Amino acid sequence: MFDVFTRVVSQADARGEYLSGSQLDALSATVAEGNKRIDSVNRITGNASAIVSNAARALFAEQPQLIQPGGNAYTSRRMAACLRDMEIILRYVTYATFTGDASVLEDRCLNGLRETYVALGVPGASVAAGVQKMKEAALDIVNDPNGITRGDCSAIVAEIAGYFDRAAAAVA
Amino acid sequence: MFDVFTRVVSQADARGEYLSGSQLDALSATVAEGNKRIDSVNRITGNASAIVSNAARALFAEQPQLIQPGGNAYTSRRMAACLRDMEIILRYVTYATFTGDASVLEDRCLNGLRETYVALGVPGASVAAGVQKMKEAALDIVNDPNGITRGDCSAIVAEIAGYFDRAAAAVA
Amino acid sequence: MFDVFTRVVSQADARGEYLSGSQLDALSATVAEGNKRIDSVNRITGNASAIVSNAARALFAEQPQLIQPGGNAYTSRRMAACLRDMEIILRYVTYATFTGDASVLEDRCLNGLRETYVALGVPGASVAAGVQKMKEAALDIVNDPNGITRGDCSAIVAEIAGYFDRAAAAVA
Amino acid sequence: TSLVSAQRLGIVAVDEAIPLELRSRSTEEEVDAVILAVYRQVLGNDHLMSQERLTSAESLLRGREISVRDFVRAVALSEVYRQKFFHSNPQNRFIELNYKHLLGRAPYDQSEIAFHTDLYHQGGYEAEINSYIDSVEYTENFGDWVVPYFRGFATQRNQKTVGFSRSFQVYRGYATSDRSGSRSRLTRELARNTASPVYAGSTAESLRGTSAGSRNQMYRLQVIQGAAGTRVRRGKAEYLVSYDNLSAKLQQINRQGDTVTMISLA
Amino acid sequence: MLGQSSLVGYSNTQAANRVFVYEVSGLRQTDANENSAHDIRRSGSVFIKVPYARMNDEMRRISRLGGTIVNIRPY
Amino acid sequence: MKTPLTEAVSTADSQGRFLSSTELQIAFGRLRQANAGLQAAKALTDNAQSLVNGAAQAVYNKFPYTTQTQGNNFAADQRGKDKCARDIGYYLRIVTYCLVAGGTGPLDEYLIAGIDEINRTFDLSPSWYVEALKYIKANHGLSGDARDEANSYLDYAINALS
Amino acid sequence: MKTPLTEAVSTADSQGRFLSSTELQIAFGRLRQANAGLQAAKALTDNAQSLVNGAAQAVYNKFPYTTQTQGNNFAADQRGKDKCARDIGYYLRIVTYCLVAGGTGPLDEYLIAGIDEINRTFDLSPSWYVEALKYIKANHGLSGDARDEANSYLDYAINALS
Amino acid sequence: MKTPLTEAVSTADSQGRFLSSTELQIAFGRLRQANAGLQAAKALTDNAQSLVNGAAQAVYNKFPYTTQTQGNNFAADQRGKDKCARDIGYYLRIVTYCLVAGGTGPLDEYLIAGIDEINRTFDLSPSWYVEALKYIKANHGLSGDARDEANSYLDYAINALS
Amino acid sequence: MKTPLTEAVSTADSQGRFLSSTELQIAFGRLRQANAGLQAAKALTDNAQSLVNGAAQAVYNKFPYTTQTQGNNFAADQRGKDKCARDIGYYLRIVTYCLVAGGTGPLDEYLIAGIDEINRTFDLSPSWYVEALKYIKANHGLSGDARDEANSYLDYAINALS
């Protein structure tokens, strides 16, 4: 597992040299924007149930064959498994946002997820579509300007979007 | 696992439709054969040791190379393993006869047995021949009109014959 | 376990009432001295090895019958276990210092230790003597005025000494 | 533990036990030993009849189809395990047997009793049993290839001290088994988060001299007492009485309303 | 390829009557298994047969220990 | 799925045993119950449309707010009503599957496992489906063994829901 | 104990579940079988002494050496014959217990478990007991469901011994 | 009991190591947050009664059927209204505990664990409590860090119920 | 590596939980410490060569036998001196990594784990490295939060060695 600091540390250790001034300055900039990252993490986890549920409902609306009998999301057990994956993907994206590195997302969630879905017959393209729906919902929530100290969060929104892209491309 | 009822249930649930009149009539006919099916299961079970031991002795009578030193049935552990396997195949055939569906014999005993026997060096052809011998003994015992309300058991014998062929074909 | 806040929380829920103003101000007082608590934990941790080793050397000097052949500290295995028990007690004292509550020290370390030592034959009085030496040492590091901001740490020192007293009472 | 405490506590064989690991390309006798070790420890040292053996599970273990952990799981889920540890036992006793057999330790907390009780109530025996084998504790201690062994007598990381003491309540000796429906010895100890004195091996015996009666046998009566006479100084009490005064001591404890927790030969 | 008889739990769930083979590589010494009593014997491709009902657990276990799930095949 | 025949085989396989007289008695009990189960399923599927429509209407009458307030989880619009009728049809169809199979296995497999977190996720109260199943209990018109077995499955769903 | 009622409750309790229609059908099969099983037990009980003596004589006839060669494991003396008659009486008595209980559970707990170690330690041939069981099966004089249940227990013992 | 200090010790003790600088920063974060949490709990405590009655009224407004339908689970009488007001007060009081504790530990220990069983066996709709929590969010009048931490606890409860 | 961010996420993941307020406070404490850690790392790397050279000389001064004793493990010749300076540089560089990361993680991953077998196999006394770390403590010139965190790492290494 890596965070934003430990990734630079590991690369420096492989080279066997101290962090340069530029890398230290880069991490200082990361710390200066750390408050936005925490607050963005908080806003996604505060609306996690709404994000997962709205994305899933929209997904079955545009892909009715998932919930038709014989569909992969049909029956309660498979439907519950589907929402659980939605929730798991969202949770690990928040982890990656919190740490600032994608290592937690790739090593603990997307590791073998593609071949999990292939082996189970799960339609990973529809999983990716649901993940993109979370992306639009979660990015709108993070970018909501009401009840918060105004600032620019463009960098963290792009980073969160990138984590969502990693998960959607992994399951596809 | 599936039995004769849950098999058509699983097919109907996948199509998301109720069972038609023809399917229910077929299940009713199965119920009308239920006494004969229980008799066949009971007769094979009550002669399980005799079927396995006689078939094994006949299987070693012809094909003597199994029990010569260096053969696969040589040494006590491998002979016990061979005897054990004959009994296991027979036991799962009785399970399949009891349930009216071949899922239990295939999923728990047959699927992966050929590759397992190839990796161990077990001759698949010879164990298939033992299964054929178990077939003939069990079918004679089931088709024994003495000491039972005589009737037409042709349908249940054909099902048992199919299960034995399934075992022999999957192992060879 | 419990920390200084959750202890008040658990008592309030059993009474089924909100924390009063006095309890909230008491916890405000507790978080006002949080920095000294962190300093004391850090200072004991930074010299934990020296604390354990000096206390063991003093204990074996005052009680030579422990390291005498046939003693309970004789042999490397028993000596290693003894030094490990000193380090363990010190570690759990720091845990209780960190949380502001003694629950971690009691529940995990102290509960069952007297019976364990009596069953093992470990002299509880000797362990209690070792804990007093670690206590004496650890308060010297905690109360060391060099290289730290001036202030009154008498309250946290008494709390740490209370935890060490619990440890010594428990073993004997 | 070291020898000097081990002989007193009767845990010498546990201390000198070597973990058994099924390595790759193991011979027939190694699998035989591994299967025997699993039966000994998972079934709590019962005389296992050959008709109760898991012939298919041990066949899969022999043929490298499953791991030692899978074979341990198959034995734990087997109807033999159910009959002798689940179907005639209370739930708290059953899960302490699970802790002893599968993780090699005694329960640490009453929350661990609260867990595996709700888990049973929601997900059945299979989910509850799989909790131990799939746990983090099972993975670092035994992994996929080491037969579980008792660990309660040794200092473990993330262990409570009570575990060592409580270990002697679930491990009664090398020649002991978990065979007879019985209630847990740890119920009150776990619920009230206490520790009981360890009386195992030679630890239970006490000096007799001329104070013991005609047959020179003392009995230790551990009781819970309150004021019902003379002043009571402690809630817990221990009484050492000869055989000839055992009935009288019992009857006067009874008429004071004191609860007897344990009687052992001392 | 045997195993489904003992790997699949005795609960008769049709979903649970499915086992899968996991191919895992690179089982390294990590901070997650510092206190492991047993030692890692192989870091190459190892095959773990996992029933459906435990696939959630096993992959987590693999992911904490640095193992890379390279392939998953129906049994 | 959990059925008399498959459970007998699964527990016999767990013990590595052939099928003894106990399993044969279980099959005899299954045979005794099977004709009523098949006849109950046929009777239920004959007027399944009327039963589902009446059950949906009973839920609407017992819970008028479902047809009035706006919301994804409510049947104020036609989409909600179609989703609701489809759910009742799901419940009734799986109940007929249970009658055919001889146990609550189809309900556990297809409906019961995971229903509560579906209901929590989509804000569907279990009380709605309880009223629907109560209507199905009160208006199926079955008698004898068929009535008792169908009601056991319907009460199983009700008990799982509440 | 391997009996349908204990089996049904064991499966339900292992699942932490109430008794569903699956368990009810198990009880229905047990009820459908119990009277025939009980009168098979009584028919076997009333003819038990003659059956045991006849079974013992059949073993002596098929294996004449057991009545001649000296040895503790044989029936050459009256002591060995009493042991043999007691063993066959044990087989018949636990078979009646199986008929009463409706399953092989009495045979498993009282006789089957560990019988291999017994016949090996005291060098008793299991084939002798198989012959005794075959005589009992051929001479109990039962019919129908009574015959079927009783023969299943006798053949269960025969298969266990071989 | 999830709080920053207890979890730091739980992690360190699970690794059997002394508290390093990682746990010190955990305590530092708890210290930076504690005053805002304490002021949040005091502000909620002083305003608890109006918040509880207003939350109950908001739930009655959004779900009017709760106030005329007869039943043990509804508030059409004074007994139901008392139970409703008490439940919302429990929610509000345990949220203040979380603010005092610095984590969701009071919510997990006292309210969240088992709430699903309770709302189902007494057929209480979790949507009622979601609106009650939403009203408390909209009317607690907190600002800054106190508002952010209190809303996280209220949203934690909401996500648990939804 | 062990750090407040990674440890918080690992604890949350082990419980399968979203990041609650406890984890946010952990991140806040890490942010409160991170700047001082970065200037601490900058000061140590700005003065790395003099600190390493002085640390080697201090080790040689306190343990003069390493300068004249012939052996692979001693620094009598230039090769031993290069190895000694390289080891101290390794210690100093990983401490800066720990300051950057905010935890003892780099020390545990890169240096602490296995250092005992290394010192034993190559006959390196840990007392030499303890003296080198003390020199770095006494001459790093750090003040405030920088010094405190840096000395925590250095004493972590000393306690691990001693």
Ligand SMILES: *[C@@H](C)[C@H]1/C(=C/c2[nH]c(/C=C3N=C(/C=C4\NC(=O)C(CC)=C4C)C(C)=C\3CCC(=O)O)c(CCC(=O)O)c2C)NC(=O)[C@@H]1C
């Ligand atoms: C082919 C399989 C053979 C055959 C079978 C056959 N059996 C019956 C009828 C019955 N058989 C039973 C069975 C049992 N009763 C018991 O108590 C037990 C032990 C648990 C068993 C196995 C029963 C209950 C019946 C019904 C009543 C009766 O005795 O008739 C039939 C008759 C038709 C029917 O299916 O009901 C038949 C055809 N007959 C043959 O000729 C084959 C050799």
Ligand SMILES: *[C@@H](C)[C@H]1/C(=C/c2[nH]c(/C=C3N=C(/C=C4\NC(=O)C(CC)=C4C)C(C)=C\3CCC(=O)O)c(CCC(=O)O)c2C)NC(=O)[C@@H]1C
């Ligand atoms: C009794 C315990 C001794 C004592 C303590 C004391 N410390 C402070 C102030 C601070 N100490 C810290 C602590 C740390 N900062 C870090 O980065 C690290 C490593 C993670 C630690 C351990 C902090 C942050 C402060 C506040 C700022 C400051 O530098 O002053 C005080 C002053 C009052 C206060 O509570 O802050 C005191 C009293 N002082 C003594 O005299 C005792 C020997």
Ligand SMILES: *[C@H](C)[C@H]1/C(=C/c2[nH]c(/C=C3N=C(/C=C4\NC(=O)C(CC)=C4C)C(C)=C\3CCC(=O)O)c(CCC(=O)O)c2C)NC(=O)[C@@H]1C
């Ligand atoms: C929903 C959007 C889509 C969908 C989902 C779906 N997934 C499964 C099954 C599994 N998903 C996983 C993945 C994980 N489990 C974890 O613990 C983690 C984190 C480490 C991940 C990423 C696994 C392992 C499984 C199988 C095991 C289990 O479900 O317990 C299913 C069920 C598949 C089946 O047939 O049983 C489903 C339905 N399906 C869709 O159609 C959506 C597009």
Ligand SMILES: *[C@H](C)[C@H]1/C(=C/c2[nH]c(/C=C3N=C(/C=C4\NC(=O)C(CC)=C4C)C(C)=C\3CCC(=O)O)c(CCC(=O)O)c2C)NC(=O)[C@@H]1C
């Ligand atoms: C006998 C007719 C033939 C024969 C058999 C033989 N088989 C093995 C070994 C194994 N057989 C199995 C198969 C199963 N085990 C089960 O539990 C089940 C149900 C799931 C089956 C179908 C397995 C797994 C093995 C390997 C483990 C073991 O050896 O016990 C052997 C032994 C091979 C060896 O010892 O290396 C033998 C001899 N051999 C013949 O020649 C006959 C044609």
Ligand SMILES: *[C@H](C)[C@H]1/C(=C/c2[nH]c(/C=C3N=C(/C=C4\NC(=O)C(CC)=C4C)C(C)=C\3CCC(=O)O)c(CCC(=O)O)c2C)NC(=O)[C@@H]1C
């Ligand atoms: C040293 C000051 C004294 C001493 C110590 C000593 N202790 C043991 C053995 C054990 N110590 C414990 C204690 C704990 N284990 C834990 O996990 C915890 C933390 C929660 C504690 C407090 C236990 C349980 C044991 C027994 C198991 C084990 O040894 O691992 C010994 C060894 C006894 C023996 O005979 O082996 C010793 C020597 N002995 C002295 O003489 C000192 C006064």
Ligand SMILES: *[C@H](C)[C@H]1/C(=C/c2[nH]c(/C=C3N=C(/C=C4\NC(=O)C(CC)=C4C)C(C)=C\3CCC(=O)O)c(CCC(=O)O)c2C)NC(=O)[C@@H]1C
């Ligand atoms: C035979 C001379 C007498 C007799 C014996 C008897 N013993 C048991 C049960 C057990 N025996 C042991 C003993 C050991 N197990 C071991 O591993 C060791 C070696 C260290 C020993 C000494 C144990 C632990 C048991 C418990 C049960 C088990 O199955 O292991 C029984 C069984 C009692 C029962 O089934 O209820 C019997 C019958 N009985 C007599 O009548 C003889 C005088």
Ligand SMILES: *[C@H](C)[C@H]1/C(=C/c2[nH]c(/C=C3N=C(/C=C4\NC(=O)C(CC)=C4C)C(C)=C\3CCC(=O)O)c(CCC(=O)O)c2C)NC(=O)[C@@H]1C
């Ligand atoms: C009718 C009683 C009330 C009602 C119905 C309603 N249901 C949904 C949506 C879903 N229904 C289910 C249920 C199942 N799907 C299955 O596969 C099975 C088991 C085989 C069942 C019982 C599910 C999973 C959903 C969500 C996904 C989907 O839409 O298919 C809705 C829509 C809710 C939403 O958020 O879209 C509605 C309206 N609502 C009422 O008001 C009626 C009283």
Ligand SMILES: *[C@H](C)[C@H]1/C(=C/c2[nH]c(/C=C3N=C(/C=C4\NC(=O)C(CC)=C4C)C(C)=C\3CCC(=O)O)c(CCC(=O)O)c2C)NC(=O)[C@@H]1C
């Ligand atoms: C006693 C508390 C009450 C009562 C009972 C009663 N029942 C019967 C008879 C039958 N009941 C059944 C039961 C079922 N059939 C099914 O299919 C199922 C569901 C799977 C069940 C539970 C059956 C099979 C019978 C026999 C046939 C028949 O219905 O007549 C009786 C009659 C006597 C008998 O033992 O058969 C009685 C008395 N009656 C009361 O008044 C009590 C309130």
Ligand SMILES: *[C@H](C)[C@H]1/C(=C/c2[nH]c(/C=C3N=C(/C=C4\NC(=O)C(CC)=C4C)C(C)=C\3CCC(=O)O)c(CCC(=O)O)c2C)NC(=O)[C@@H]1C
């Ligand atoms: C009779 C068919 C043949 C025969 C019998 C014979 N048996 C024994 C000894 C024993 N028989 C048993 C068997 C059981 N005990 C039980 O409790 C049960 C289960 C309910 C059974 C089946 C046992 C345990 C013994 C040994 C102990 C004992 O003496 O009772 C003997 C004597 C052997 C000896 O060495 O004493 C004999 C002679 N002998 C024949 O020749 C017949 C053909």
Ligand SMILES: *[C@H](C)[C@H]1/C(=C/c2[nH]c(/C=C3N=C(/C=C4\NC(=O)C(CC)=C4C)C(C)=C\3CCC(=O)O)c(CCC(=O)O)c2C)NC(=O)[C@@H]1C
């Ligand atoms: C108010 C929003 C709605 C409402 C309330 C209502 N609640 C109950 C009953 C109970 N409420 C609880 C909840 C808790 N108990 C606790 O200990 C805690 C955690 C600290 C909580 C959240 C429980 C357990 C019950 C049942 C037992 C009890 O009565 O106390 C009822 C009565 C239900 C019944 O059957 O008696 C009601 C009416 N009702 C409305 O209409 C509101 C919309």
Ligand SMILES: *[C@H](C)[C@H]1/C(=C/c2[nH]c(/C=C3N=C(/C=C4\NC(=O)C(CC)=C4C)C(C)=C\3CCC(=O)O)c(CCC(=O)O)c2C)NC(=O)[C@@H]1C
């Ligand atoms: C980014 C997508 C949005 C945004 C964020 C933003 N936040 C701040 C500042 C702060 N946010 C916090 C966060 C919390 N305080 C708490 O108590 C908790 C709960 C435990 C949290 C999550 C804090 C502490 C600050 C600093 C103090 C302050 O309130 O200002 C900023 C300002 C810059 C900064 O980094 O401090 C920004 C930009 N702002 C937007 O406009 C986006 C929609």
Ligand SMILES: *[C@H](C)[C@H]1/C(=C/c2[nH]c(/C=C3N=C(/C=C4\NC(=O)C(CC)=C4C)C(C)=C\3CCC(=O)O)c(CCC(=O)O)c2C)NC(=O)[C@@H]1C
């Ligand atoms: C200096 C304090 C004293 C000294 C040094 C010395 N060290 C070695 C050899 C080794 N030192 C290490 C240490 C590390 N390598 C790492 O990767 C790290 C962590 C990042 C550390 C701390 C190792 C592994 C070796 C052996 C392999 C190697 O040579 O690099 C030597 C040489 C010993 C030998 O046998 O060649 C020496 C001389 N010796 C003194 O006298 C100084 C006081």
